[PDB]
């Protein structure tokens, strides 16, 4: 490779690059979707939660996790070993990979992570795909937001009835109506969360789910009626994009390096977007010479509260595969002493954002860096309970990019500065003693550490935003307009969680897909 | 639902490709099956050659740890002494392969698999030595270095792959001091043997293509016109549960389709096994053969382990090169300069010791990833090396894995369930090989005083090297499962593949020598 | 009471203060032995390993230890939890107790420590009492060494004759002298390690040992020849000694807090001696405005090894033969068996090699009780055996213990803050400890595998060998606090006791030393 | 370490019942309600294990109550 052009480029595979080229390609556009990332599955961007063994032991997709998450800013400026031979050579501050010298760990943001692979978080993620409450969480400049959801949640195949049936959905669901007393609004009950998926309808196979990712919504438009595959899109993994070059607002070439074989790329388009989520963007724009004042500020994404609970004794007194015994465990005179249907599908449950309630529940069980479940524990024992709290976007929040320091792709080093807002600390407090009350109402804590009820240190949401946010106006309060379009550019575009300019609790990669079509359509327009 | 090729692999490990390139470049029609999804666009490409691990070689151990899954998880007497009473609990859960009837103490934690197209060969650390011909060898085969060269072929064998690594030499001169030509002059302290080899693509020389399964196939995937070859196909998310047979002539195999969830038959003219050390047994055992000696003889290596900060005299020796046309690769510009004196892209050591006379273990001076001794994210690894030795486990029928009949794993197939320790015999040995390790480590620095990186035993499997389960013999004495052409005691047509197979303590990473014994049984299937 | 006075004033009632008691009272002085901390025991600081229940476990007596040792500069500056719920308070860098903001962590000493106790540190010590190296660890301007350590090894009741018959101490010595096979100087070879202790003669006890505690040195001069306490010497635990009030190089009188009654107390005396060790001592100068240039400077102690092993199946093969009259002694009776294969009265390995030519750390082979590597309360400790190292810290200037003008301790005196580093010169040679041990250790068994046994280095401070603050020297030149006789340059009638006053880099535990140079100083105070 | 959590049991340190007192050689107690052992003259025990009642509070006060009602009945007699 060397040169090459398509009327779009955009750089990211993740669930908001793919919506992007969907919606962009369904409606006659040609693009070239890259990423830094390798494809880990015979098709682009395949949900890895899909295989047999994940379907039988959820708990061990954690590892697929840990092994997609990498750490952005990793402090080294002061680490010393009170215990090591001094015969042996020390040095602190290194430099090499995402680590940072420059980095205070107390406004750090420890857990800022990105994936980079052909699909990013989109082929790991627990699919939650709600929807941001009208009075609380969505702003009003976005005209057609019901429209764009609806778009959205076709493309993710977004669905309610797949935990329907759950029996421990129920038990639970029973016990928390009757905790609250009905004191939540009637408009945003306990009710099942929405997720990006569905069960499966091949044959047995019922008893398993097909969780979205990216190649889900890639899928329709991939091969032509005809089979071959389609030349308007094209996939390039292992294409690290490092600078977009410029002239006047108007977007030329993309400088790209292809790591194997390795050679640098560049890549002409008519139209260029940036989905590479958080802190990558930002970090792509300042190293193109792009930094309006409001880039990478705004840094908010959602305080946590994380706990598991083993269900009370009373629940489990109150509660597919029957061609094929074998996939029960037991035969004979041996028993499974966990009286818990092992196919009674997870309890997957939510209250919303409401009135009072500037917070995002889920009762569930699914699978992340923490709270992994012990792997000699039947982990039918277990709920798993995640609120997410307000973060209010603040200027004195940032991400920000060293000149003589650099990451593993060789890219301006990333160093945060972010704390808390004051504001939003009594109502995660109330969002604490909530979460509490709830789980101590369907069981005990699992008196593990790791399942302690506890606020996740910053960035384990993996729900950052505001860094690239939108406005009406180039106000220097924002980086793009309500087209998702940067300030003073013809042809560059944004997507993702880093466009929302507004405090919210809710998952929010549907919403981006939102503003994405939203943008898209405003490209097709001109 | 049905269908047939004239022979069937099952497993797609590093040993079952291996079959698949010999019986397929010699004219033969494949089908190679597996229980695990495809982890790459291509076949069992190994997931080490992504740039980021060529960036950081510590962050290949998450892979690693979502490769690996545990194969008999004590269950049986759990209980949690500070649990509220009002919430529910029961001791001995048997979901997956969670096991009431294992005792932990005759346990073997670590004995892990991976389900993968690929297996273990898209994660392993491609360590390819050969047996030292007295200590590790056995006699009844004929042509060892004949297999060896050709199985070195397929796996792209290579020592030149760190040989100019300035910490290896720096680390070389040391140990060579150490050991004042104590060791035999024909296994000297030299560079490890690696599946594996330097990049040529332009500045890309900084990294390396590690060998997967592919590599092993690419040559017999597609015909001398590109397209793709009839005589291979490959099987992903297909868990074979039971071979059919008669009167020692195998016709079939029942297998589980994951995805569309469907029964289906595999008719075929030859049927291999190469499921590695456990599940081969297992799906063995399913189908009612059952020979005296499967899963019995389980054997693997002893390991000790540690890892090391380097001395600062090396350090200081060390002062001199790759993408030269890429500054901003080093991480620094300008009045930023990188405080670790060790030339970012210098090649990682890689030497071993082998075995020899007086020294029944095998030593690897490297940085390597596995679930273990993981280097922090805080710290530079350039700071560190990793060793590894690996003993002799003798080979014993008093150690084996079984197969519970009421208890199933993952897959619905019999519960393992092991009864394992280490001989009493190579004790004295084991506890010789720490002496050294150790004495090794202290002459290139001081240890790295974390717990994790201590220098230790490590728990039973986690050599991921088990052996002997289904070891082969002279004769149908039973001792033995398959004989020397790696074919099972009583039938016509079924084989075994893997180091299952090997019946002979050894020290040494046996995978390369697993290939060759199929490359023998492989020319066995078409020479008849 | 409010002003008290004898003809001396001891402060520190550790085993160093009460040898100067010993030797002066003994020699017809009367003193006052004043210290910060507590009475543990019917007696004046009685050893506190020497009850029946440490006698049969000894793993346990550690948690006596935790009891007595205090960190002395606990680093506040930067401590930020990251996962608080941002409702509750928080402010880092408090200055409460021994917090200190100012402490960097990375020049720390974090387990430099004290004990505040009647006794000191000598009422949990392990009791090990070796002789300075005539040539790589003695100086030369002290001409009487032997006849000093004969002197005040007969106060400590020093012993080597305690675990001479020893069954583990014999197979170890075995392959010890096999592993070093005649490398080692005869003058310094495998041998007993001397200990302050003795073995019971009272019936079947003697199968335990009564460990030295400072009670052990003072009783001989407690009471008179007529069973009544002596008056030549009074104890005051629970005050405070805060400053000394000093006039043209003449000590006055002592400002003391009684924290019960909570009264403040004035001590007059003819001579003062200041043995509150190695850091506490040179604090009490600071704050009474005696600040010779080399105070709390030349820090020093051990760097050290540590590690512990699992007896070798060979060596307890080696071994199967106290309590005749007492068979419930051993746990069992009938058809139980204790499945430990090591006689339970077995005496403890306790062994050591010298510091000799090419060899500058000490070694010990042996089983006590301190922070570190307790063994677990699920195993049997005759399974194990623990290695500690020690080796030379060379005294440097530029390490050092000074005291904050604006934050104070937990006896609100000015709180001490460390400068502290390993010198660059120690290094090999520390290194070189290290290969020693574990050799020394993998020819006996193989490692303890846990974390907490595995072979380390152990944190600056862990040695509790802390020496070189309050230095001496032949001048009032070359830069020391006292002279050769522990008395202060440019004063009458104050003295410094305590591992503190040792100028020279050396390996060995240093107590016995210190004693003998308090001997020396009341000597020159007797004449 | 600060999580809330239910103690293994121990923790308390307030062990209770194991020489319990009742009305009568029931073969339900140790000790009558002056702490005296059933069919014994002069053999008395104290503390918390002659609690013969499920209760929450920090026992020690009560244990030397009873105590103070046995020294009486020794008294008295
Ligand atoms: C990890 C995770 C995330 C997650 C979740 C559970 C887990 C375990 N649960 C979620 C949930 O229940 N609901 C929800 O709404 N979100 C949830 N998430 C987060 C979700 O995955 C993210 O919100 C989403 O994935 C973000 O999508 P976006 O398209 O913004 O992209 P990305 O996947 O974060 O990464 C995009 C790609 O960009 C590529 N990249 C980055 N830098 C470059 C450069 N310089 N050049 C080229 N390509 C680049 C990355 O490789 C990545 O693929
Ligand atoms: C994990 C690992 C392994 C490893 C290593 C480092 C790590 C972190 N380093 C090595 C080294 O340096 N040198 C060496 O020689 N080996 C090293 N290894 C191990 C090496 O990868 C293995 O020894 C080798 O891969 C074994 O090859 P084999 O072909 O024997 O098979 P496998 O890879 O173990 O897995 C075989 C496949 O069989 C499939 N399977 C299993 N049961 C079934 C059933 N019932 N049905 C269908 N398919 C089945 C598995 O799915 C697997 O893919
Ligand atoms: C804790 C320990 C120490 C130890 C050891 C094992 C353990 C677990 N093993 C040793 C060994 O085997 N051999 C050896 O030579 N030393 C060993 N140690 C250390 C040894 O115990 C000490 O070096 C020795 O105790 C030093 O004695 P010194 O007389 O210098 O005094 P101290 O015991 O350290 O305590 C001094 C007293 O001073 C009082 N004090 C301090 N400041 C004041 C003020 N301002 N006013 C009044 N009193 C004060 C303290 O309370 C203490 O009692
Ligand atoms: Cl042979
Ligand atoms: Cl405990």
Same mark, same amino acid.
């Given at each position: 490779?060397?040169?090459?052009?398509?009327?779009?480029?955009?750089?990211?595979?993740?669930?908001?690059?793919?919506?992007?080229?969907?919606?962009?390609?369904?409606?006659?556009?040609?693009?070239?979707?890259?990423?830094?990332?390798?494809?880990?599955?015979?098709?682009?961007?395949?949900?890895?939660?899909?295989?047999?063994?994940?379907?039988?032991?959820?708990?061990?997709?954690?590892?697929?996790?840990?092994?997609?998450?990498?750490?952005?800013?990793?402090?080294?400026?002061?680490?010393?070993?009170?215990?090591?031979?001094?015969?042996?050579?020390?040095?602190?501050?290194?430099?090499?990979?995402?680590?940072?010298?420059?980095?205070?760990?107390?406004?750090?943001?420890?857990?800022?992570?990105?994936?980079?692979?052909?699909?990013?978080?989109?082929?790991?993620?627990?699919?939650?795909?709600?929807?941001?409450?009208?009075?609380?969480?969505?702003?009003?400049?976005?005209?057609?937001?019901?429209?764009?959801?609806?778009?959205?949640?076709?493309?993710?195949?977004?669905?309610?009835?797949?935990?329907?049936?759950?029996?421990?959905?129920?038990?639970?669901?029973?016990?928390?109506?009757?905790?609250?007393?009905?004191?939540?609004?009637?408009?945003?009950?306990?009710?099942?969360?929405?997720?990006?998926?569905?069960?499966?309808?091949?044959?047995?196979?019922?008893?398993?789910?097909?969780?979205?990712?990216?190649?889900?919504?890639?899928?329709?438009?991939?091969?032509?009626? @005809?089979?071959?595959?389609?030349?308007?899109?094209? *996939? +390039?993994?292992?294409? /690290? %994009?490092?600078?977009?070059?410029? &002239?006047?607002?108007?977007?030329?070439?993309?400088?790209?390096?292809?790591?194997?074989?390795?050679?640098?790329?560049?890549?002409?388009?008519?139209?260029?977007?940036?989905?590479?989520?958080?802190?990558?963007?930002?970090?792509?724009?300042?190293?193109?010479?792009?930094?309006?004042?409001?880039?990478?500020?705004?840094?908010? @994404?959602?305080?946590?509260?994380?706990?598991?609970? *083993? +269900?009370?004794?009373? /629940? %489990?007194?109150?509660?597919?595969? &029957?061609?094929?015994?074998?996939?029960?465990?037991?035969?004979?005179?041996?028993?499974?002493?966990?009286?818990?249907?092992?196919?009674?599908?997870?309890?997957?449950?939510?209250?919303?954002?409401?009135?009072?309630?500037?917070?995002?529940?889920?009762?569930?069980?699914?699978?992340?860096?923490?709270?992994?479940?012990?792997?000699?524990?039947?982990?039918?024992?277990?709920?798993?309970?995640?609120?997410?709290?307000? %973060?209010?976007?603040?200027?004195?929040?940032?991400?920000?990019?060293?000149?003589?320091?650099?990451?593993?792709?060789?890219?301006?080093?990333?160093?945060?500065?972010?704390?808390?807002?004051?504001?939003?600390?009594?109502?995660?407090?109330?969002?604490?003693?909530?979460?509490?009350?709830?789980?101590?109402?369907?069981?005990?804590?699992?008196?593990?550490?790791?399942?302690?009820?506890?606020?996740?240190?910053?960035?384990?949401?993996?729900?950052?935003?505001?860094?690239?946010?939108?406005?009406?106006?180039?106000?220097?309060?924002?980086?793009?307009?309500?087209?998702?379009?940067?300030?003073?550019?013809?042809?560059?575009?944004?997507?993702?969680?880093?466009?929302?300019?507004?405090?919210?609790?809710?998952?929010?990669?549907?919403?981006?897909?939102?503003?994405?079509?939203?943008?898209?359509?405003?490209?097709?327009?001109?």
């Amino acid at each position: 490779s060397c040169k090459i052009s398509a009327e779009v480029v955009i750089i990211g595979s993740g669930p908001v690059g793919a919506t992007f080229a969907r919606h962009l390609v369904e409606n006659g556009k040609s693009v070239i979707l890259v990423d830094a990332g390798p494809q880990r599955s015979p098709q682009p961007g395949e949900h890895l939660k899909n295989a047999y063994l994940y379907q039988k032991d959820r708990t061990n997709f954690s590892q697929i996790v840990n092994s997609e998450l990498y750490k952005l800013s990793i402090p080294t400026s002061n680490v010393k070993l009170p215990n090591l031979d001094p015969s042996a050579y020390w040095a602190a501050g290194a430099v090499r990979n995402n680590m940072n010298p420059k980095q205070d760990p107390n406004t750090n943001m420890p857990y800022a992570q990105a994936a980079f692979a052909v699909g990013g978080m989109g082929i790991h993620w627990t699919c939650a795909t709600p929807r941001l409450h009208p009075e609380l969480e969505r702003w009003h400049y976005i005209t057609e937001w019901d429209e764009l959801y609806a778009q959205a949640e076709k493309y993710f195949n977004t669905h309610t009835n797949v935990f329907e049936r759950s029996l421990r959905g129920a038990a639970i669901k029973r016990r928390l109506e009757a905790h609250y007393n009905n004191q939540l609004d009637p408009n945003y009950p306990i009710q099942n969360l929405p997720v990006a998926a569905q069960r499966r309808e091949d044959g047995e196979g019922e008893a398993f789910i097909h969780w979205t990712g990216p190649y889900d919504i890639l899928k329709p438009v991939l091969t032509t009626e @005809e089979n071959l595959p389609n030349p308007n899109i094209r *996939v +390039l993994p292992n294409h /690290i %994009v490092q600078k977009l070059h410029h &002239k006047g607002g108007k977007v030329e070439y993309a400088e790209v390096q292809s790591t194997e074989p390795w050679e640098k790329v560049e890549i002409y388009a008519d139209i260029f977007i940036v989905a590479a989520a958080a802190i990558k963007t930002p970090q792509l724009l300042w190293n193109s010479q792009i930094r309006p004042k409001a880039l990478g500020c705004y840094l908010s @994404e959602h305080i946590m509260t994380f706990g598991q609970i *083993v +269900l009370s004794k009373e /629940i %489990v007194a109150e509660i597919y595969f &029957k061609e094929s015994p074998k996939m029960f465990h037991v035969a004979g005179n041996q028993k499974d002493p966990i009286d818990i249907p092992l196919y009674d599908p997870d309890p997957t449950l939510w209250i919303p954002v409401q009135k009072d309630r500037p917070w995002h529940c889920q009762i569930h069980k699914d699978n992340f860096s923490y709270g992994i479940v012990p792997d000699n524990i039947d982990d039918r024992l277990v709920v798993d309970l995640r609120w997410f709290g307000f %973060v209010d976007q603040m200027p004195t929040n940032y991400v920000t990019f060293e000149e003589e320091i650099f990451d593993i792709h060789g890219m301006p080093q990333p160093t945060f500065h972010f704390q808390y807002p004051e504001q939003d600390a009594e109502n995660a407090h109330r969002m604490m003693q909530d979460m509490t009350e709830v789980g101590l109402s369907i069981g005990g804590f699992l008196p593990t550490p790791e399942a302690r009820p506890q606020f996740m240190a910053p960035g384990s949401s993996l729900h950052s935003m505001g860094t690239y946010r939108m406005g009406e106006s180039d106000d220097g309060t924002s980086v793009v307009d309500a087209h998702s379009k940067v300030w003073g550019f013809d042809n560059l575009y944004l997507g993702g969680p880093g466009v929302i300019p507004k405090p919210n609790g809710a998952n929010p990669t549907l919403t981006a897909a939102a503003l994405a079509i939203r943008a898209a359509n405003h490209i097709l327009r001109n």
